[model samples]
Target: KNPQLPTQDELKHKSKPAQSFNNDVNQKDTRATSLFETDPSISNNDDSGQFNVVDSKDTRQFVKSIAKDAHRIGQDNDIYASVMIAQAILESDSGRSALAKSPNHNLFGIKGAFEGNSVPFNTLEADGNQLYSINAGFRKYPSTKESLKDYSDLIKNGIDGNRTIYKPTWKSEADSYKDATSHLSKTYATDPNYAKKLNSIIKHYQLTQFDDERMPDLDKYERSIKDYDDSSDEFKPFREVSDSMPYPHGQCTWYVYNRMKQFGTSISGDLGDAHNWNNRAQYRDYQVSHTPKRHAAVVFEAGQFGADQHYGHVAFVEKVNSDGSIVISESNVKGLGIISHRTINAAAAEELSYITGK
Candidate 1:
C-alpha cells in the first residue's frame, strides 16, 4: 500500500511540532498562503494522454490557454500564435504531462538549464525501433507565463541563443500556421508524424483564423448599364456596353454570350469556341457577313492576327470607323477578365457576323 500522510491532529498535537516549510523571509511561498494553480480536474473521461482519442473539452481548454500565452509573446517574437498553440498541445498532451502539471511548467519538454534552474525528469525518447529512457535536465519555470516565453524565444532563436539560422527558415514558413508546423516538424521534433499531429489539431480546432491578418485584397471593378433598346436601331445595339459574363467571368465566350443575352437575343446550343460562333451563326440562319455594321458580332478565325488562338475570339462592334476600321468591346482580349476595346482593319472586319433577332 502507498504510504499515507498522518492525520493533521497527529502531526499538530504530537509531542514534536512540524518543521517550518517556508524559510526565506524575502520571498513569499504559495504553499503557505494559497492553493496551487492547477489544470481542470478530469471526471470519468479517458486519461490515456495519447495524442488521439483524448477528451476534446479538456484539450480545448488547454489549447485556449496556450493561445493566450502565444498572443502575449508572439507579437514581440514574429511567431505565429496559432502554430504555437498547436505545438504546445501536441508536445505537452494538452497540459496533462507530468512536466506540465505542478512545479515544473516545461510545456515544450525543452532540455537545458534555464537561468540556473532545472528539474531532472525521466522521459522516453525513441526513433523507430530504437527506444531508451534518460533522466534529462529540463528547463523549469515557476509559472506558465515564464514557460511560454522561454518556449517562444527558443523557437524564435535557437537553443544556443543565436538568431540567424533557425529562425529564418521558421519565419519563412510562417505564411500559415500549417506551414510553420510543417517546417517545425522537420527541424524541431524527432517524431516523423509531428507535423501531421499538429496539422490535425489546428484543423480540428480551426486554429488558423487566430493567426495574424495578411490576406491579399481581391480585384475590384465598376459595372453600370444604361438601357437596352434593340428595337431602336435596325441592327440594334444596347444603350450601353454593359454585361457580366453569362457563364463565369474571365472567359471570352462568356462575355459574348452575356452580351447577346443582355440585348434580348437568346443564343441556341453551345457556342463552344469563339471562332466557331461564325459557323454556328450560319447554321442558325443568322447572317454571317464580310461587311461591317453599326452593331454586329465580330467573330475572328483561329490565330487571326494573333488576337486569340485555340478558341479564336469574339467582340461586340461599338463603332464602325469611317476608314473601314471598327472599335470593338470584348472581354479577355488584351488580358484575362478585362472588358476593353481595340480597333481592327477591314480584313479583320471581313470575319464579322450579324446575329439577327432573339
Candidate 2:
C-alpha cells in the first residue's frame, strides 16, 4: 500500500503531544521549568556501557529461549515458539545480518519514532519486510534493551494503527504477539503465499528463543568497535540545510512522539540537565532512562551557534551508525534521512529537547 502523508488538520488535532523541555510544577517538583534547559542527552554515554555480541553458533537457540518467555504473557500462555523464532530469523538471517549484529542495536527493522530527536539509517522496508527499498531514516534506541522492548511492543500493538483485522489478542501486555500475527496470514498480504513465507522464515531460522520476555541481555555483551572509512559512503554527514519544518509544527511533534509511547518509554515533561543544545550526551542519557520507549531522540549539533552541541533540530534515533554515526528521520525531511542522515549532518544520541533532571 502507498504511504499517505498527514493533512494539515491531521498534523494538528489528530496528532499526539509535542515533546518539549516543559515542567509540570503542580504534578512534580523541579527547578528547571523545562527539561530542554538542562541538556541531559549525554548522560548515557558513560553508563550505557556496551552491547553483547550475538554469536552465530547459538543464534537459533537464543531466539527460541527468548521467545518461550515472551509467549507466556497470554492467559492461555500458549507460547508459539515457532512463530517468534521464524520472524526473528527471517528478519536477521539467523542472527547474522547487520540488523542482527551487535551494536547496530536494532534486531528488528524498527525506526526512531519520537519527538525532538532523530538519527540516520539506510533501511529497505516499510511493512517490516526487507523487500521494500533502500531508504534512510532515524533508528530510535539508546541501548539494545530499549530496542528489544520496543520490538516486542510493536508486535503487540500494530504499527501506527495499521492493525485492525485482529482484535486485541493479548489479554495482558504480554500476549500481543499472538494477536499481531494471528491475522498475519490473511491481513499481512493479499497473496496466498504470504503465510508460507512467514512460516518458512520462522522454521528455517528458529526464532522461538526470543519469544520470551526474559532473555539474555545484549547490553552486557561487548560489541565490536567499527571503524569509519572515507570510501564507505553508506552514510555521510549532510550539509545542505533546508527549513521544511511542517506548517503545523506544534501538532507534528505530538504525532511522532505518541507513535512510540505505547511501545515502551517516552519523555513526558522537562527534566532539568538537558536544556541546552550543547550538552548532547546529557540529552541522550535523560531520554534513555526517562523515555526508555521504543523510539528515542536523535539530536543534532548546529553550526558555531551550537559549537559544542547542536542548534535546534530533532529526528528519531534510528540506531548507532556502524561508521560511528547515528541514523534518523524527521517530519520535515521529505526524503528521509537527508536532514539527520550522516550525509548532510552529524547526529548525536540526544533528542531535540532534553529531559531536565531535577
Candidate 3:
C-alpha cells in the first residue's frame, strides 16, 4: 500500500525536463526524447516489443490481401492455397509475429538467412512436441511475395537435399488439405498438432473458398458439335503410352485416367462414367475450366458433341498449340480396344470442359 506506480505525468514532472521533451538542438541530448518514446502507449507494437494478436478484422484483412496471390502461386505449384493461408496464419500469428512483420516478412516460420540477410529472433522449436525456445536466424524476405513464393517452392519441390520430401503436400497426391497438412505435420514440422491446427484454421476462415473457381458451364460447350463422334470416327489408333492402369482397358474413362497418370497428373480413379468426370471434378474441387490446357481431361456430357447417347466421353489433352488448338488423345474413338488422337481447334476447344490438376 505504501508503494504506488507513478503516472506518466508524475514521471514527466519528476524527470530532468529539457524543453518539454524535444532537444532538437545539437541532438546530443536526446535523453528527453528517449523518455517520451519509452512511454508504453507509444512504444508498444514497435519492432522491439512483444508480438500481440491483432484484431480479427486485421487478420481477415491480411488474408484478403494475400489470398489471390496465394491461390495463383499455390495452384501453380500444386499446393493448396487454403493450406498455404492456414500455415501462414498459424506460423506468422496472422501477420503479427515479429518475424512476419516488416523487414523480416517471414510468414511461414521458415528459418534461414535470405541472400545474406537475416534477423536474429527467439523462436520455439519442438522436440517430439516438447517446446524449447532458442534464438535462431530466421529468413528475411524482400516482401511477403518472396516469402510466399519461397514457401510454395519449398513445399512443391521440397528441400534441395530431399526434393521429394514434401511430395505428400502436392494436390495431385493429396485428396485435400487435410492430407497435405497431415504430411506437413508429420514429416516437415516438429509439431504433432500442426495438422489439426491448420485444418481448423482453414475451416474457421472458410479458406476453401480460395480453392474453388468458377466451373465450366454446360452452355459453354452445348452449341459445339466437335467431339470425335463415336457416330462418325474410323478406327484410328493411338500409341499406348501406359498400360495396366487401374481402370478397365478400352473404356474411355480407363484410357483418360491412365493418360493423366502417364502425364503425372492425379485424379480419382473412381470418376464413374465418362460423363461424370466434370461433375466429379466439381465435387472433388479439381480445377474445371472451359479453356483447355495441356494434360487436362476434356470431359463431355452424353449426347453432347455426338458422344455416346448414354455415356459421355473423356479425353486427355496431349498439347495446346498456339491459336488455342488442342491435340487430344482418347480411347474408344478408334475401337473398343483402341486409343487415338485428334485436333480440337481453338473455337471447338472453347466449347469443351477441361479438368486440370491445377
Candidate 4:
C-alpha cells in the first residue's frame, strides 16, 4: 500500500481549465507566507489600480524589492535571476498592468486561477492585419512574493502533460539568461523580439547583480554535518529538525517525514512519488545534490539501488561516517511497515540525491 495515489487536493492542478496553457497552478495553501519577502515602500497594496512604480526611484525600489525573490528562487530552483526579474518587469510594464497590481499581483501573465480565484481579461493577439481580443483567466495572489512563487512554479512545473516544455529556462539547462529568454521567446511567447526586450531590461537594471557568487558551496559542510561539529565556525543548522508535515503512515515518505520530525527542520516534500522527490525538493527551494549530509533525505531514481522500479525510494540519512559510508533508516524496504538501517559505501551513495534546506 506504499506509494499511494495523490489525494484530490494534492492533484489540484490536474483539472486543466479551458484555454489554460503553460502557466497555471491552482495554488497550494502550504508554501511559507513569504518564502521570499518583498519591499514595503511600494507594496502589493496598490490594489487601488494605481501604478505601483514610476520614475527612477520607483523603478529602482521595485527592482530592488523583487530582486531577492528572483535571485533565491531562481538560484535554488536553477532558473536565471536576470531572466526571471526581466520577465516580471517586462510583463508588468513597471507594475502598471492591472494584473500586476495588488490583489491580482500576477506579474507573469500566468493563466488559470489561484485558490480558485481569477480575473478574466480580454487579452489581444494579432494575425497579419487582424487584431482580436479573447477573455482568459489570470491567477491572483495575496502578495507580490506569492505571485513570484507562482510564476517560478510555472517555470519549474511546465504545462500539465508536457513537463519538459520549459526545460530551457533552468540554470542547469541553459548556458545563459539570454538562452533561457530565447527559449521562452520561441516556446513561451510568439514575438521573436521577446528575448531581446528581456535582455534590454536585464542590462538596463544590471539585474545580474542580484545573482550571487556567494551561493555557498555546501559540499564542504557535508563532513561537518556528521561530526555534529558544534566547534566549527561554519556550521549552519538545516537538519535533525522537528519538522511538522503529514504523510500517511506505513510509507517510505511517511517514515522519513516523521524521522526528520524527531529531529527538526521546517521543509517538507509534497505528496510526489519517491522517484520525483529530488526534483520536487529542488523546485521547493531545498538544496539538492549527490553529497549526503546527516539527516538529509536521500532519494533514489526509479530502478536504482534495488528500489521499487516504479516508485523508487527515499530514506533519512542517519549517519555519515568519516570513511564516507552512510547509515540510513527507512521503512517498507525489509518489509511493509518495518523500519531498519543499512550502510552504503561512498561510491554507492554517490548515485542518490540528498535533500536539505539552506
Candidate 5:
C-alpha cells in the first residue's frame, strides 16, 4: 500500500525511454496516452539505458489547474462535501504538491499501491535517502475522480471492510472520524506518528466541518459577556490526558492542531494551552464550527508544563468569571505529582477570549 521507490537492482537495467504518449498517432490509444501524462518519457522496454522521470516542478499552480477541472468524485458518491476539499488542501497542499501527482494518484496517501515492489527509504545511509523506490506497478485511473473515488471507497471499507482507519469528522457519524484516523496509522503512512500527524494536519487546518454537508450556522452566538466578566461558562473539560493531551513539548502543538478535526470541542486533557502554532487559525475554525457554547473544553499547552513544549493540557472557559479565568482540569503536573486534578474554573479571560475566537 505504501509507495515504494525503484531499487538500485531494478535501476541497473532501467533506462529512461520515450513514453507512449509522445506519439500523436496513439491518440486513440487511451492507455498509451495516459501513461505519458505521468511518465511522459519513461521507457516501455528495458532495451535502452536507464533514465529518471524528471519533472521540473509539481507547483501549487499546476495542481490548481488540474483541480479546477477534476470532477468532485465525492459529489457523485454523495460525500463530495467540503471535507474533501479541506482534505485536498491539507493532503495535496492545496493541490499543488508533488505527492498528489501521477502514479500514486494518492491525494491523501491512501495505501495499497506498492504491494510487492516496495522499497525502504534509507535516509541515514550514504546511498540511503530514507526513501524506498519501487519499479513495481502503480495504479492509473482514467480520471482524477476515479482515484478520488477509490480513496473514498477505501475509507468506507478498510482492510476488506474491517473499518480501522478513522473516518472523516462529520456530524452524521461520530465513529467515522475516529475510526479513520485510528486505522490510518496502520493503513497509510509507515511513520508511527501517522495518526497524530494526520489529526494535527486536519486540526491545524480545521478541515473537519468541511466534510459536513451543511455549513454550521454561527450567527446564533450573540456577543454578550458582561464588560467586567472575563470568562465563558460553556467550555467543557477534556476527556483524557495521556491519551488525548498533547505532549508537553512545542512540537506537539503542530501535530495536535493538525490532528483535531473542526468538529470537536475538547482540546487537551492535561494542561492549559500554553502555545499553539495554529492558535488564531484554530480559534477561527472552532468558531465557524459552532463551538461557541461557553464552558466547552478549550485545550492548552506550553506555559507551565516542564521543559516539554507544545500542546500541554485542557481547560474550560469560565468566560463569565473573567478574562483568563477558565475552568481547568489538569493531569501530569511534575511537582504537584497529581495526574488528575479537579476542574479549576479560574484562568485569564484573555486566554479564554482567544479560545472562543469571538
Candidate 6:
C-alpha cells in the first residue's frame, strides 16, 4: 500500500507563510552565493591533525602521481581509476593522514587483515547525532602501489571471494567520474556525502581526464567572473603574442582550449584572443547563437560584463536554467589557475554569444 502525502497545493494551503529565521536565509539562496559562507565544523578538533600544516603543492603532486598510476593499472582491471584515486585522496587526505603516512600505506582505510598483516588504529565514526571513536584493525600494505592495487581489486572482484555482495557496485560503470562515484557512494562508504566530496576533489584537480573512458561531451569549468575586474591593470594581458604559445595561465582561453583539444576539436593554433572567437567561429562556419546551450562557448565582446578590455572573455555554458539564466564555468578569473562558476541573468546573457561546433 502507498502512503498518502499532501499535494503541493494542499501543503501550501495547510501551512502558513514561513517567517524569516535569520538574515542569512533572507539573502540570495544560490550555489554560487552560498560558496562564500563559512562551513561549520563538526568538532573542535578534526582527525586531520590541526597542528600539521597542509602542503597543498606536495599533496597535489602526490595525488597526480597516484592518479596516473591508478589510470595505468585500471585500463585492464575494469576499475574506475578516477573514482579510486579520488576516494583515496578523501580517505588519506592526499597521503597526509596518519594511516597513509604509516608504513602500512593503507590509503583507502581498508580495515581488516591482508596477508596476515594488520594495524589497529583509532578512528572516528558517526552514528546519528553521536560521533564515536573506535579502535579498529586496518589492512597493511608494504607499498602505496600495493594498497592502490588491492583496493581496486577488492572493488573489482570483491573481498573474501564474496562477489555477490559487491556485484551491484561492480556493475555500476559509467563514462564519467561523477556517475561512477555516485554508485560507489551508495555501498563503498557510510557517509551520505561521500560521492559529493570525492567528485569535488576530482573536479577541482581535473582528475576525470585521467579516466579510461569517453570524456563527457560537455565541459563546464568556472572561476569567479569578479576575479578579473576590467578596471584593474592586473587583469590586462602583458603583451601580444605572434607564435602559437599556449593561452595564459588561469585565463578562460586556456580551459576552453584544453577542453577543445580533449574533445578532438581541431580549433587550435593561432586562435587569437578569447574575444575574437566570435569572428573566428563565424569564419569556421559554426553556428553562433545569442541563446546559450549546453556545450556551447559563451563568447563576449571586449569590455562586456566586466570582461577583459582588450581580449574579452569566454566560458563554457554548463546549464541553461528555466528563468533564462546560465551557469558558466571558466578559468583564471580568480587570479589563480583555479576554475569557478557564475550564474548570470538573461539581461547579462544578452551581451554574450554562444559559439557552437564540434
Q: Output the number of the lDDT-best candidate.
A: 3
Off by over 4 Å in 6: 1-55, 160-172, 213-358
Local distance difference test, each candidate: 0.53, 0.35, 0.61, 0.59, 0.34, 0.55
TM-scores, all models, native as reference: 0.43, 0.33, 0.44, 0.44, 0.32, 0.44
Candidate 1 TM-score versus the reference: 0.43
* TM-score for predicted model 4 compared with the true structure: 0.44
What are the per-residue Cα lDDT tens digits for candidate 1 across 126-211?
34323223344677788888888887777765644345434643545556665677666546654445555666566655555455
Clash pairs, candidate 3, are: 238-339
Per-residue accuracy of model 5 over 206-321 as CA lDDT, tens digit each: 34443444443333212211121215423322212222213321122312331232324334322223334225436435442223225444444454333134334433333334
Tell me which of candidates 3 and 4 scores higher on lDDT.
3
Error of 5 at 356 (Å): 46
- lDDT at 188 for candidate 2? 33
If the candidates were sorted by their lDDT against the true structure, best first, what order would they fall in? 3, 4, 6, 1, 2, 5
Worst 10 residues of 6 by lDDT: 30-39
User: What would the per-residue lDDT of candidate 3 be over residues 146-244, giving only the tens digit for each residue?
Assistant: 899888877776655567777988889999888888788655554444665676567656677667553222233223212222343332223234423
Give candidate 1 regions above 4 Å deviation.
1-55, 168-173, 213-358
- List the candidate 2 regions with Cα displacement exceeding 4 Å: 1-58, 68-81, 114-119, 125-132, 159-182, 185-194, 204-358
lDDT of 6 by residue, 235-256 (tens): 2212212223244322467566
- The backbone clash count of each candidate, in order, is 0, 97, 1, 8, 89, 8
Error of 3 at 276 (Å): 67
* Model 2: per-residue Cα lDDT over 202-247, one tens digit each: 4334333345555445443223223223364432222111123211
lDDT for residue 78 in candidate 6, whole number 0-100:
67
- Candidate 5 weakest lDDT stretch, 10 residues: 30-39
Cα shift from native, residue 193, model 1 (Å): 1.2
RMSD of 2: 17.7
User: In model 3, where is the ten-residue run with the lowest total lDDT?
Assistant: 30-39
Error of 3 at 279 (Å): 67
